[PDB]
């Protein structure tokens, strides 16, 4: 069926990322494939044990931090169906475009037996409960409940269990997450990773190049604000300097300024202006 | 449209998959069972075979999972709206479908319906802000109680449902328009006991098993947590290559609930004692 | 349009079996019936009796029970429509149809009509700048102007209804057209009085009567649920197999159903 | 129909038309050299390109002019799309149109896209609109690939929003351009005295003398301002005392509605 | 041609079948009749006459009785312009009505409009404005120097762009409102002139009991007293009968 609101993504037009483009993250990357990649294959064991396949996840943590990097290397290794979506298309200018489509959405999956989908972000959709103040917002919650019955209302097993990406995981309208509706929920931290910063800081250096007149893994020693998405963003900028001067590969004096060339703006009167 | 209609492909559930729930079937079957099982019996008195009923209670229950099995062991039909699908991005589509709805069941007296959610048709207020949805709650209730509904109430009982109760229109309920309601509470501990007996039917001539030793401990609300902890218990056995399973491997699975039973952080605000 | 209209099937709702009230009900028979008995009397002092009435809501408190009882009595036509069923995608379809009643009211001098729960038509005159929904506002004007453009009133009768007025209905109604803006709500005793005045018909109360205390302590409620109160005693009879009619198990239903809908009860402050 | 935006490209026009603060002019060109003329370098290192950039400069300083010139350097389709111009009370109309924007965009590459006044981008209404701000940023680098199509946000209210700037790895080259000195003000007259007659002398010393706060648009308007009543002289050259009869009042409207300009 | 029928068989109205405060009638009677019948009074000063009596009055007031009054008086032809026949789903076909109307109207004589309830169509994916534009094209042409006027009424004067309502369209506008007791008294005489009563009593003190209110309730409230008399079997009416229900009509409303 056509249902021209989302097409089969990745038949031949797909991204090209790998599992190994990540650094570590196996503290979470293990469990997810412990409930994704195997049920493709060892379904008989899930019949030997487990009244149903544990599936349904809510991946969270702060955004711009590592969530969506992992979402799609699996897309490179499905041997099965896969769909993307902008996670707020459902907010249509008029009414009804979702409830007409969302019922046609899973209609795409049930025919595409088996498959998987995902979502960009649902920060606008998380809404526990309001008193009915206006229809301006009530077209949100009606979609959310309809999503739920569309998930495990009646159709039980042949469907696919799905994901939940976000930018926060406390506003989430409860009665969505459940031991049966999801049966899984994971994240990953932001604080210092001596074990992971020590390798992710140069896992990309394999993808990059470097001619060491000295040792350049020493900014890792300088632990103040170990983040997750900057730590490749820097050399995503620092490499633009040897080229800026026709230098063929960078030097370690080229990047230490590039570290601070991303000025951390620790001094800003916008912080000083408010309280005092 | 007949996609909403009932099924020649019934689900396969049952109201003895449903441990802990023991009394409610006796309290609610009869309005759905007895005088329709025996109208002459009821008509011996013939007080009023009432209109539908309602069920309120939190999630974690399987009010749904109850309503899947009742459509087995029926003698009647069990249609489904796939809740809130009836509405569209227009006006005229509302009332016609409701007009189409009742008549679809007039032709089948021994046959009934299902809602899951009425959070989206609740508490109509209007001063310019509102919506056409409020228009449709009337006509269904109108054709519920009018010159043409009691003939359905001669033929029909029904049910509504939701998970949040007091956030809707009281002008809906003329008690008698809905003649009975009930709570589906969270379970007792010992009510939780027979649950895991249902779903973990996977032990392999094992021993040292104390199914009572888990509702020993719980203070939750859901019964589904008995599955959420059970279903991922076997995951441990699934990863460690040994199909077998025990108590302790099954017990720390609550460590997943160590978040749920402890995710609710607390405020230190001693403004008032 | 015509198909739904001619609902000539009055139920066994028995006018005068109902035990509610009198003054209201003479007021309609005076509004309607007696005018169809000896209207020369209106011609004696030269009276144009009213063009229908409008009750109020207080739901579950006797909106309609008379009405199908009147239909049981109607001795004339009886009509029935819904505004939500009246409306359509296209422009002015229903408004083009709304006209077509009054000629079908021109069908008869015995021309009368109930109307079904206007709350989505003629509710309130918001500007409706936000598209689309001006159709409703475009429709009410098609009626009221049709209603009193130039009419001898042709027994073009009417009786309306809703559940709440001040929520809606700002300007549509006008006196003379609808002079009688009238009421139905709880009696504060007479639910005790004549409701079981009816329901004493079937039942036996196979040990006593007990009715001297199966009574109202000024309890805020709606007597419509009394038709539950009769019910569950029979059920609780058959929760314990009493084929007869008791008075003891009957206790619970008020203690059970009236107890759910709790009130604040903050009267430790007006003493 | 967004032709109305994307149809100001074909006529080749010089990148020389603005001197400005050249080191910034050296920045954005050299960093956008790479995809077109020397894309070998990204390969020899194997590093991703700049996934789009932004800038800042206060109002009326050739910002759109700067952008409108670059597309003619190489043959993109310079669009024009005001932020506030795409603003409708309809909820999805915000987030629906943007998706069709990238749609036609990726339908035509190697091309270019532009925004200026995006600085506008617990309450009831606001809880939906952040999703738009949460949507498009995702549509930059959320799931899809982007071959030869880029973007600039070029505002005048640099207190825009923390999160778009909170993680400046999504965007980069978060550049600034301040207003001229004599260093800048002087050479700008050379292009603005290009196609017009004049006497010939070091007359621009008044330029560095005054105009400490004007921008390029009004001095251009000051040029033509002088030429109007310079025809009463009617001479075959033009004198720098001529303009002096109007440099005052142009500042008195530059006086009008005093607005500040911080950089961030 | 749904409304292709000028006037009814018998308008039963008079300018003295109304209390109507006596003042809102004069200029209305002046604009409609004095250019019509005595343009020498116009050229007595050499005037720029008007073309329309702009109007707003809350419904349930005898403007519409007043509207049906000029019908029965002048004896000329008449119209009714309402969204039913006017507004039609077929885009553009709706404007066949206005054209066949006005292009006819310029031909005819004393065919002045009562196009009431233009608040329906004249309010601000909707095509109503283009019909409103279809109007004003027709009016700026003939607008001055004619026996014809444009006099109608509404319920919501602040519900329409005045881009149409420039001074050459409806200049000497109209405003209605409830009466004094004396206005409430003389109107009360009217509907009192049918029945049997306790003749010769102090009716006027009841018009003291006319706060902000319509005359429509007064022609009503007398009949409820007769209804009260009907249940009372009072073959002839008294004072207290009028009281026994009028005390209830407002309190039931209040």
């Amino acid at each position: 069926d056509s249902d021209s609101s989302i097409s089969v993504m990745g038949e031949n037009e797909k991204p090209d990322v790998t599992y190994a483009d990540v650094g570590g993250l196996d503290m979470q990357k293990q469990e997810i494939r412990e409930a994704v990649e195997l049920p493709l294959v060892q379904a008989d064991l899930y019949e030997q044990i487990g009244i149903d396949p544990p599936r349904g996840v809510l991946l969270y943590g702060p955004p711009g931090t590592g969530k969506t990097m992992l979402v799609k290397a699996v897309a490179n290794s499905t041997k099965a169906a896969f769909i993307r979506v902008n996670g707020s298309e459902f907010v249509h200018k008029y009414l009804g475009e979702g409830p007409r489509m969302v019922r046609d959405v899973f209609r795409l999956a049930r025919e595409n037996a088996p498959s998987i989908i995902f979502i960009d972000e649902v920060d606008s959709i998380a809404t526990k409960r309001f008193d009915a103040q206006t229809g301006s917002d009530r077209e949100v919650q009606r979609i959310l409940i309809e999503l739920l019955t569309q998930m495990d209302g009646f159709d039980q097993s042949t469907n696919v269990k799905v994901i939940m990406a976000t930018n926060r995981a406390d506003t989430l309208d409860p009665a969505l997450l459940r031991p049966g509706r999801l049966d899984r929920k994971i994240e990953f931290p932001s604080l210092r990773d001596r074990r992971e910063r020590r390798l992710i800081f140069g896992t990309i250096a394999s993808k990059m190049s470097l001619a060491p007149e000295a040792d350049l893994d020493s900014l890792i020693i300088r632990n103040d604000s170990l983040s997750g998405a900057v730590i490749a963003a820097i050399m995503q900028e620092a490499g633009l300097r040897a080229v800026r001067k026709n230098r063929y590969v960078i030097l370690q004096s080229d990047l230490e300024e590039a570290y601070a060339t991303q000025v951390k703006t620790d001094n800003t009167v916008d912080k000083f202006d408010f309280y005092k | 449209l007949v996609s909403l209609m009932m099924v020649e492909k019934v689900p396969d559930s049952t109201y003895d998959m449903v441990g802990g729930l023991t009394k409610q079937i006796k309290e609610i079957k009869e309005v759905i069972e007895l005088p329709v099982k025996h109208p002459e019996l009821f008509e011996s008195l013939g007080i009023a075979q009432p209109k539908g009923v309602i069920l309120y209670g939190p999630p974690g229950t399987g009010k749904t999972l109850l309503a899947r099995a009742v459509a087995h062991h029926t003698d009647c039909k069990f249609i489904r709206v796939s809740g809130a699908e009836l509405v569209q991005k227009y006006i005229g589509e509302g009332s016609r479908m409701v007009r189409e709805l009742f008549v679809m069941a007039r032709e089948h007296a021994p046959s009934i319906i299902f809602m899951d959610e009425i959070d989206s048709i609740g508490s109509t207020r209007v001063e310019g802000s509102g919506g056409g949805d409020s228009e449709v709650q009337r006509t269904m209730l109108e054709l519920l109680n009018q010159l043409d509904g009691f003939e359905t109430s001669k033929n029909i009982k029904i049910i509504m449902a939701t998970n949040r109760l007091d956030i809707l229109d009281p002008a809906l309920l003329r008690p008698g328009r809905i003649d009975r309601k009930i709570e589906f509470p969270p379970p007792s501990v010992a009510a939780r006991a027979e649950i895991l007996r249902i779903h973990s039917r996977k032990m392999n001539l094992t021993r040292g098993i104390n199914l009572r030793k888990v509702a020993e401990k719980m203070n939750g609300c859901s019964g589904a947590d008995v599955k959420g902890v059970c279903t991922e218990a076997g995951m441990y056995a699934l990863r460690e290559r040994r199909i077998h399973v025990t108590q302790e491997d099954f017990e720390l699975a609550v460590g997943k609930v160590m978040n749920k039973n402890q995710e609710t952080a607390i405020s230190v605000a001693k403004l008032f004692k | 349009m015509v198909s739904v209209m001619k609902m000539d099937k009055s139920p066994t709702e028995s006018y005068s079996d109902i035990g509610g009230l009198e003054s209201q009900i003479q007021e309609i028979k005076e509004s309607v019936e007696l005018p169809l008995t000896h209207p020369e009397l209106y011609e004696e002092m030269g009276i144009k009796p009213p063009k229908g009435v409008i009750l109020y809501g207080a739901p579950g408190t006797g909106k309609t029970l008379l009405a199908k009882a009147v239909a049981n009595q109607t001795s004339a036509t009886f009509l029935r429509i819904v505004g939500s069923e009246l409306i359509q995608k296209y422009l002015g379809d229903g408004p083009r149809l709304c006209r077509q009643i009054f000629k079908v009211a021109g069908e008869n001098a015995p021309s009368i009509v109930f109307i079904d729960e206007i709350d989505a038509i003629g509710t309130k005159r918001y500007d409706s700048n936000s598209g689309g929904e001006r159709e409703i506002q475009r429709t009410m004007l098609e009626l009221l102007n049709q209603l009193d453009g130039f009419d001898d009133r042709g027994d073009v009768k009417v009786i309306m209804a809703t559940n709440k007025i001040e929520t809606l209905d700002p300007a549509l109604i006008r006196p003379g057209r609808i002079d009688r803006k009238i009421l139905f709500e709880n009696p504060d005793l007479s639910t005790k009085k004549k409701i079981l005045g009816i329901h004493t018909s079937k039942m036996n109360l196979s040990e006593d009567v007990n009715l001297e205390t199966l009574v109202t302590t000024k309890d805020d409620l709606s007597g419509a649920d009394i038709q539950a109160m009769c019910t569950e005693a029979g059920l609780l009879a058959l929760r314990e197999r009493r084929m007869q009619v008791t008075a003891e198990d009957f206790k619970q239903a008020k203690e059970r159903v009236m107890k759910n809908k709790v009130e604040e009860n903050l009267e430790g402050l007006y003493l | 129909l967004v032709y109305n935006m994307t149809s100001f490209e074909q006529g080749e026009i010089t990148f020389d038309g603005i001197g400005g603060l050249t080191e910034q002019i050296r920045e954005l060109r050299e960093v956008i050299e790479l995809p077109l003329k020397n894309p070998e370098i990204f390969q020899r290192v194997g590093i991703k390109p700049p996934k789009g950039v932004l800038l800042y400069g206060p109002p009326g300083t050739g910002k759109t002019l700067l952008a409108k010139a670059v597309a003619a350097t190489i043959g993109a389709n310079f669009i024009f799309s005001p932020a506030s111009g795409i603003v409708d009370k309809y909820i999805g109309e915000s987030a629906r149109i943007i998706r069709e924007m990238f749609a036609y965009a990726k339908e035509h590459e190697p091309c270019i896209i532009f925004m200026d006044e995006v600085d506008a981008i617990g309450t009831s209404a606001d809880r939906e609109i952040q999703r738009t701000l949460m949507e498009l940023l995702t549509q930059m680098d959320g799931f899809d690939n982007l071959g030869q199509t880029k973007i600039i946000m070029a505002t005048n209210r640099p207190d825009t929003l923390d999160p778009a700037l909170l993680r400046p790895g999504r965007l980069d080259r978060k550049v600034e351009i301040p207003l001229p000195n004599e260093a800048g003000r002087l050479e700008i007259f050379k292009i603005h005295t290009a196609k017009v007659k004049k006497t010939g002398e070091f007359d621009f010393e008044a330029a560095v003398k005054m105009s400490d706060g004007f921008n390029g648009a009004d001095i251009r308007n000051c040029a033509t301002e002088a030429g109007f009543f310079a025809i009463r002289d009617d001479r075959d050259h033009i004198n720098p005392d001529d303009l002096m009869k109007a440099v005052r009042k142009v500042a008195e409207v530059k006086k009008l509605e005093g607005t500040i300009e911080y950089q961030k | 041609s749904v409304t292709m029928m000028t006037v009814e068989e018998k308008p039963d109205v008079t300018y003295s079948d109304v209390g109507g405060c006596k003042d809102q009638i004069e200029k209305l009677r002046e604009v409609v009749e004095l250019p019509l019948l005595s343009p020498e009074r116009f050229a007595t000063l050499g005037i720029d006459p008007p073309k329309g009596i702009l109007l707003y009055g809350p419904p349930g007031t005898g403007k519409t009785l007043c509207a049906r009054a000029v019908a029965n008086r002048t004896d000329a032809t008449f119209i009714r312009v309402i969204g039913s026949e006017l507004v039609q789903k077929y885009v553009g076909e709706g404007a066949r009505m206005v054209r066949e109307l006005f292009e006819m109207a310029r031909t005819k004589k004393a065919c002045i409009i009562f196009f009431d309830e233009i608040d329906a169509v004249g309010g601000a994916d909707n095509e109503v404005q283009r019909t409103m534009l279809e109007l004003i094209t027709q009016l700026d042409g003939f607008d001055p120097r004619g026996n014809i006027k444009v006099m109608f009424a509404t319920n919501r004067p602040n519900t329409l762009d005045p881009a149409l309502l420039r001074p050459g369209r409806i200049d000497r506008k109209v405003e209605f409102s409830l009466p004094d007791l004396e206005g409430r008294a003389n109107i009360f005489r009217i509907h009192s002139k049918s029945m049997s009563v306790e003749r010769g009593i102090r009716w006027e003190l009841i018009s003291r009991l006319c706060p902000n209110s319509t005359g429509a309730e007064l022609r009503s409230v007398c009949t409820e007293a007769g209804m009260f008399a009907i249940r009372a079997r009072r073959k002839v009416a008294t004072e207290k009968d009028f009281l026994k229900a009028v005390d209830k009509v407002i309190s039931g409303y209040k």
Partner: peptide, 15 residues
């Protein structure tokens, strides 16, 4: 032979 349709619609916008 037809193009003369026009159906109303429903919206709900922030006030």
């Amino acid at each position: 032979n037809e193009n003369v349709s026009a159906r109303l619609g429903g919206a709900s916008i922030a006030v």
